[PDB]
Design a binder for these strands. Sequence first.
DNA 1: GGGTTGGGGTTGGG
Lengths: 184, 205, 187, 148, 179, 117, 349
Amino acid sequence: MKLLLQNQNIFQKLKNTLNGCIKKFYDTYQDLEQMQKFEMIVEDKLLFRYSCSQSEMFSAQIQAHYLEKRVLQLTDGNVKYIVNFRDKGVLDKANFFDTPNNSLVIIRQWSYEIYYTKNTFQINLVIDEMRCIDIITTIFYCKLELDFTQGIKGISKSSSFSNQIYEYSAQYYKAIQLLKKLLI
Amino acid sequence: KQMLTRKEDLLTVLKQISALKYVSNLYEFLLATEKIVQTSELDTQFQEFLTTTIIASEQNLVENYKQKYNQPNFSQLTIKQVIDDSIILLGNKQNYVQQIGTTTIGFYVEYENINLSRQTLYSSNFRNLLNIFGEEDFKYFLIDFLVFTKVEQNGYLQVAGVCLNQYFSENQYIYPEIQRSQIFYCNHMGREPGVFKSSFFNYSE
Amino acid sequence: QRIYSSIEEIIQQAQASEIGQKKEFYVYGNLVSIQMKNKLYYYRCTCQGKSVLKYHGDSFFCESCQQFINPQVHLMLRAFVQDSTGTIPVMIFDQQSSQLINQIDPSIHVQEAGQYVKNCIENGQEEIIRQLFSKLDFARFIFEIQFENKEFNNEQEIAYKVLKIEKENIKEESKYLLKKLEHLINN
Amino acid sequence: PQITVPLNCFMINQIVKAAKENPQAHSGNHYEWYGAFENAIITAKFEFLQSINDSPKIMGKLSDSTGCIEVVIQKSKMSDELPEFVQAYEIELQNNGNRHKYVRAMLKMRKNAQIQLLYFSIVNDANEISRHGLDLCLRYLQRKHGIE
Amino acid sequence: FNPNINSFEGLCRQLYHHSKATVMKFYPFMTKLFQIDLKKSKQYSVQYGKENTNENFLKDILYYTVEDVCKILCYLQFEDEINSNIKEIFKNLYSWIMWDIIVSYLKKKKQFKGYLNKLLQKIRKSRFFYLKEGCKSLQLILSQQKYQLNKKELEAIEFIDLNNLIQDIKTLIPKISAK
Amino acid sequence: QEQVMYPRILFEQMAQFRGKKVTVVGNVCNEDQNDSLVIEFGPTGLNQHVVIDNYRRVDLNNTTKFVEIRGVVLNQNIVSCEELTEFEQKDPFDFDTYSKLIHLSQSDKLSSLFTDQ
Amino acid sequence: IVIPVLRYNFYITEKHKEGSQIFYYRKPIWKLVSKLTIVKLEEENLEKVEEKLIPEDSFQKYPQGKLRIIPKKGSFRPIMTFLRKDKQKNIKLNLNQILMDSQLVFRNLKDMLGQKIGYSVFDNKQISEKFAQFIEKWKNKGRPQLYYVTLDIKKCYDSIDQMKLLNFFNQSDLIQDTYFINKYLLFQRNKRPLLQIMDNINFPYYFNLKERQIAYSLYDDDDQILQKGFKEIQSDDRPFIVINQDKPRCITKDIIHNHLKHISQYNVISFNKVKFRQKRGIPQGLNISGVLCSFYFGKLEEEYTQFLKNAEQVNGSINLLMRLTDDYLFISDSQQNALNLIVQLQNCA
DNA sequence: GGGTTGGGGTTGGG
Ligand SMILES: [Zn+2]
């Protein structure tokens, strides 16, 4: 079971989708009108939304969820992820067998979300469609993890212990630098 | 005389097996057990599922599952809880459909492998079936019967009961075998004709 | 004197352990849920035959000794040990498995256990074996458990094996619980 | 985070009373005592209770130094017999001249349902009482400190 | 053997040639079988006597295999809506073809020259008689007006009447044995 | 359908209680041989003997070695016998661990679980 | 005595078109034949190789193959096998056992390979249904005269461009990124009629048990394999029963790409303790070779057979084209169409 | 101290 999820290579899909989002934002905001750049720089609002393509779907096991903050935890093998979901409608669409916890699910589609906050940019991952397939009551002890709800601090954490995490953190930092260079 | 036919029915085929004594669809079994009545109304999809579902058992157990007036049928547990109770009751037996991809630890059951058939088990049709049946009778129906549900024009998927593959299973001397296959495809060549230097013919001296 | 650790402590140490690390522990727990789906026993020679050449008609011939040997059956069992805290899967070898078999049924001799199990299985008497295994459920003991962080087929894994199994006695277990709780209260 | 926790009759009583008095909890059968649980371990004397017109369910009684609880014993349906662990208690009771004894029982409870007792073993040593008490206190302390 | 591809004559010719190939293919098997006398084996002697154990065993095998093959061939050729009398007549015709091929091939072999040939000739004669009787009875069956024939049934009736299966088989043999 | 609260107390505090519906546990006495059942506290190195008048010494099973009584003490060393079960014990019963258990139970921090309030 | 003598003093094998008949040859004659065959193969497709060039990763990851030669009239017929597994370097499987996952994926591809992007056939059922459709169209036309042409490719496997195959694999959208493997047991009715009611009647008397594997994608596909777990084709209305299993597997397109690149570039075989390496094409004998060859040649034939797509309505001419592996068969009504097909095939070649 | 699932059987196309 662990091998099946490890063969998914979620990092490849994440890197490709991040590159696509960065390129699309770069080409779509080449106007470089100074007053427009100033006025879209506002606190706590989304600026762009890039939906992932059909090729990059993966499956993970739900370990925990939080309805008040719409925070959902995913894991596979060594790595566990903390992401957000659109709303309760995503949960209702996924015909959960008994409970969201300890259920194997497949992500039909998700979208990268970019936000400006505290004079910097944070990238959020939002799950849009969910589908449960079978219940897996097997606790996977993930030594390593990355957080999408804390930004660069939540991603660069524990980077030294995983080469893939290091590369993804470097890509994230480069994307942040390019975004801030273009907008400001 | 007996002729082969291009069209056949699963129930008709099953009735030709001597080992199985009771073969019927779910709807008629429920009517015989009086769990439901003809005057009662159900959804068309649920009725079709009941009609198409085929069950069988090695013995006639209609009386055992006869409706009891001692206590009515109301459900408060989850379908997963009922299935777990049935699996725990199964105990050490290790050839049943419902145990595929799962293991039992004491009074706790653990799922660790992917089973595509669990969707039918946990479907709303089976939920309504459990609502009609009751926990104590469902836990034993999942064991005493072989459950087959139609999912195609002619295909059926077994979801409960003993696995069908179990039905497809003082010594005497056996002489050795001549190793004739060793002759073929030998590309080795030696300076002096004879046999290989590794043979006991050449090893002695 | 001995020091006793809990299942959760063993689990945490095994997870934190690096590949190739071993450690032993002593735990108060109960055996439960012996598994029999896989093959229950294997064959080895008296001279520790690493390779046993399979033939037909119950013929055997070791390679580490090079004589016509009567096959020797070694019993292999999988079950789960669990305290009040947590549960883990364990490997039970020939000696311990025979010890439990003779304990639950004194009729069968110690090394006779593997042959008895093999005879029952081959003759087709599995109900007796199943009932005997079921009678061992929730059997309290004192367990010596060793974990190994090893890699199999280029895949990291952790394997738990039981080394010693002893008859349980409540007095020192209660004493250990008392001192642990007193320490917790003091802290 | 553990489904099995040890506690006695008084703890059962207070948990059931609190759950019934304050039912504004999650829509799940799990109880709430420093977490969710389904299994319990208790050591107390057991005695049969004679029910009326109730064949499938057998009513039990566990009196202890803190209180008394009622549990239900289930039996097989295809044939009418008793579980082996309770036949052992019955034969011991008939052998020892109808004398009750303490037992080490593991039982499962769910809200809006009866308390089912799955297995127990007769205990003949008095030190098991102290063992159970210390284990209960230690586990309660562990749960309280793990909640925080 | 798809009926959507070949006609009745084509199917008959295909079966004829395939059977002629298969009998020569299978001949070494009974040649090897005759190297062992089954009278020394109780398992076969108790079932087939002790005088002609090999002959009885071979006859039983051939008979049952031919019957199964004919049933499968009829199932493949026709649908369930076709008349049982038509199905039986075609099965008898196929059985007669197979048995005639086998008898013609084996009538010259020395090992089979004696006891077995009479039994095979009896089987072939029985098949011919049954086919003729079924063909004769089918006319009376259809004359009752109780059945309405479809296009395939009409085609089969026309084929049978054209080949004059009522009397004998000499008409169809040149058409099916042509190479 | 009813609740009776049966605290466990060592030798020293029946005098302070001066009569409550309680429970006590101890080993059976046979060196004295009174008409009624007499049990002792501790490892018998120190003399702490109490007698129950309701229950006769011999009517118990001969294999019985250890007992406990749930009932109200009437007077010092005299305790009423209402509920009585037997334990045959092949292993001497530790008393100090039971003592510390009773003390902890009497401690306010764990008293909430053992008794109400 | 007997077997060692025959093994040492003779090479024993079978010819090409002689079936299972056995033949014997003296050892020096076979040595001469081996030398001549090596000389023939070196000039065309095999080259002597050194272990320095091949990367150590693939060297320790993949086992090598063995070469066998069958006599032929005036020539030979090489056969390479991949049964061996390397005891060293922790190898427990052979090439086929390693690649059977990709074999399942390409077997799934074979289904849409039948009719979408070329004229490829794989079984007598497909051949028969195509023939039946053409026969029905011929009947509708009114039984006009017919003409046929037959031709075949020589050494199709060795004439496969590795770069072109890799490009087709990369740019082909019929292969999804990720797939899941499901195992299940299938019970199917046999060819035995139902008995009408000596007492011992069981399931094996009426059903045959088969083990099946399947690979499915995570898309919301029409066949909705996620709901059932099987994909079976039935030629009759008789029922069948399926039970699933609990051994799933995952395969990624990148793994298939790596396997294809390795087998195309670093294919190493041995002969008389002398290592060789292919220079062009894919090795025959691998479980994926037939499907890969069919796809590769289907690309070119669909490239060069544009006119056939519109011919049947441009002038209403009935024409039938099938290709089984490297063998072509074409029956039409227009001699002009046949000549055009021959010319286009020659141009494509 | 253990460990895919090893076979059985051999026809007709490529
Ligand atoms: Zn040896």
